[PDB]
Amino acid sequence: HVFCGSDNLQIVPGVRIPQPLLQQSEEEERARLTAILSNTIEPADSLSSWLQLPRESILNYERLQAKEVASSTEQLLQEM
Fold first, then answer.
1. Fewer CB within 10 Å, N- or C-terminus of the chain?
2. C-alpha distances in Å from residue 31, one per residue of 38, 58, 59, 62, 78
């Protein structure tokens, strides 16, 4: 998904990385890459949108860690 690209590359749904310019100057392309990196915005659901992970997997992971900490705090309450 990342390296294989031709004339256009969309690694995450909100960012497009074009191919190097025809004029082929490394300074200008460096500036262009830095600018297009700066213009990006990272959404709150980046872990599921920017990555290829489904939302269900992220929710399942959050639920698993929540139940783990809930079990630990339940036990600690018994420990007194």
1. C
2. 10, 35, 38, 39, 59
